[PDB]
Subunit: 96 residues, 4 copies
Amino acid sequence: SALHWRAAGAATVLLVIVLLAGSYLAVLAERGAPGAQLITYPRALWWSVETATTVGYGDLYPVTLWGRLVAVVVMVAGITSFGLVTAALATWFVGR
Amino acid sequence: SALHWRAAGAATVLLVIVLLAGSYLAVLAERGAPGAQLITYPRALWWSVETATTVGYGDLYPVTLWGRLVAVVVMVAGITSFGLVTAALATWFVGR
Amino acid sequence: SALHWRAAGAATVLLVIVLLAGSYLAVLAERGAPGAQLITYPRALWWSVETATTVGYGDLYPVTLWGRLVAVVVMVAGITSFGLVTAALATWFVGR
Amino acid sequence: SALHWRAAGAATVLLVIVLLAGSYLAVLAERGAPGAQLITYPRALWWSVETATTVGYGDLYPVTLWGRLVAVVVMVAGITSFGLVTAALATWFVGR
Ligand SMILES: [K+]
Ligand SMILES: [K+]
Ligand SMILES: [K+]
Ligand SMILES: [K+]
Ligand SMILES: [K+]
Ligand SMILES: [K+]
């Protein structure tokens, strides 16, 4: 457990924190906007996961300024996490 | 065939197993839920592929707890597999 | 121009070939299926690009067996290409 | 701050420039086309972000030649940027 494992390990933990907080903040931001569908927590968590994994079906998405702002954080933290693990497994193989 | 090839090789094999099992379990989980479209195996397999590749058009997606839970596994195993191959080809080039 | 550049270079070239051929074969496969929207070449090329980049909005997608089969090739060749360039730039930085 | 940091650093800066310019050029290209929804700047910026991150929900997408052409640049610059950072963190861990 040097640096190339603690980084990916913390990123995975941080990601889960972002997913939980992101789904919570999304509901807070999306409510008050007529037509918004991202207004309940259980499906907001499902949205955050498919957002952080860059899947993004289209069944759920933010339509507000702060809602979309929260979404961007979920994307970046998502790509970084899934990208930091990739760079982690790369360094592992290089050192044999 | 050291470690940086057996890992990506097994990941590719494991991915296919996840895609097949994921498409099967998705149908089992989605059926019983009014309005769900992911309820037949042939298109479920197509959904699993576009899910694991993080494409996610929006033509098919789970709407149940366990259905979405299966989806998350397909995503993670998908990103990992396509990410483990990337880290595999990286190590190959580093060692010249 | 060793191996970690010719690989990514060929992948980029191969990708364009897949995009052109994929868009052509998609139209051939999707036509004959009632309701299919991926039935003209100019927008098929646009679909292939957003497919290979794993974006996948949902404005265009295959609904046939062979159409979806062509799509999978576009995804895999897409992820590999954009992934082989990433592993190429990684090796470049490692060697200083 | 050698090469494996200035590259990812410039890519991040360049990405923001592409997102801003891309959202601007998208509106210019999409307007004049009946049915197009990507016709205002604030939501165009939101579209560019979810495009560069390869999320692509389906709530917004270009339907014109030049609009889709701008989109491709946003995708490529997006994948490259998020990919150049990944290759940056990889080299960092390899050198210990
Ligand atoms: K996507
Ligand atoms: K979509
Ligand atoms: K994606
Ligand atoms: K998508
Ligand atoms: K959609
Ligand atoms: K990726």
